[PDB]
Amino acid sequence: GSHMEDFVRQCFNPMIVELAEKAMKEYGEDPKIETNKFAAICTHLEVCFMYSDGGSKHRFEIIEGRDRIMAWTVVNSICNTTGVEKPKFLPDLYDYKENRFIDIGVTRREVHIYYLEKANKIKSEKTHIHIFSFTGEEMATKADYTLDEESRARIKTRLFTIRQEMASRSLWDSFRQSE
């Protein structure tokens, strides 16, 4: 029973905590042991869902947070109906307005460093990328940031808040040097 674990269960809502536990268990992992990863997955969940909440009613299909199998089903539905190309790696969202898959990144390193790694690693010329840090920085594909500024602003705020709560508990350094 780490401090970190109990911190995550206080910090994130129960639905996010449960989706993340499920995601971890599905790819082999334990939330009680790998607790920095548990916090990171919760974070990435929250951001993805805050992000889908920007923009209008029907704008995004939400991929993250589903079962791996159902997530691919929906990806296939969107591919087979928009003509858009089937990505190699699961994305987080689909943008019905701009007609692209998006993968949201949350990082404890230089926005720059994480962007290149996902770009090379996604090896998917058409999927859009949008990174946020715990520092207020963001980088997006084609400098095209999808949402208006106040929706991204509140994500950035939320992340700095998570960073502070962690630090006030002396879990931040560990969290940062776990990535």
Ligand X SMILES: O=C(O)/C(O)=C/C(=O)C1(Cc2ccc(Cl)cc2)CCN(Cc2ccccc2)CC1
Q: Say if CB 50 and CB 157 are below 8 A apart.
A: no
Taking CB under 6 A as the rule, does residue 122 contact ligand X?
yes
Q: Among this protein's residues, is 144 annotated catalytic? A: no
Q: Say if CB 166 and CB 3 are below 8 A apart.
A: no
> Could you tell which of ligand X, Mn ion, none binds residue 121, using a CB distance below 5 to 8 A set by kind?
ligand X
Taking CB under 6 A as the rule, does residue 74 contact ligand X?
no
**Residue-wise DSSP of 21-35:** HHHHHHTT--TTTSH
Q: Among this protein's residues, is 92 annotated catalytic? A: yes
Taking CB under 6 A as the rule, does residue 154 contact ligand X?
no
Contacts of residue 141, Cβ cutoff 8 Å, sequence gap at least 6: 128, 129, 130
Q: Among 73-81, 115-123, 132-140, 161-169, which window interacts with ligand X (CB under 6 A)?
A: 115-123
Catalytic residue of the set 88, 92, 103, 150: 92
Q: What does the DSSP 8-state code read for residue 143?
A: G
Catalytic residues: 64, 92, 118
Q: Which residues bind ligand X (CB under 6 A)?
A: 27, 44, 89-90, 92, 103, 105, 118, 121-122
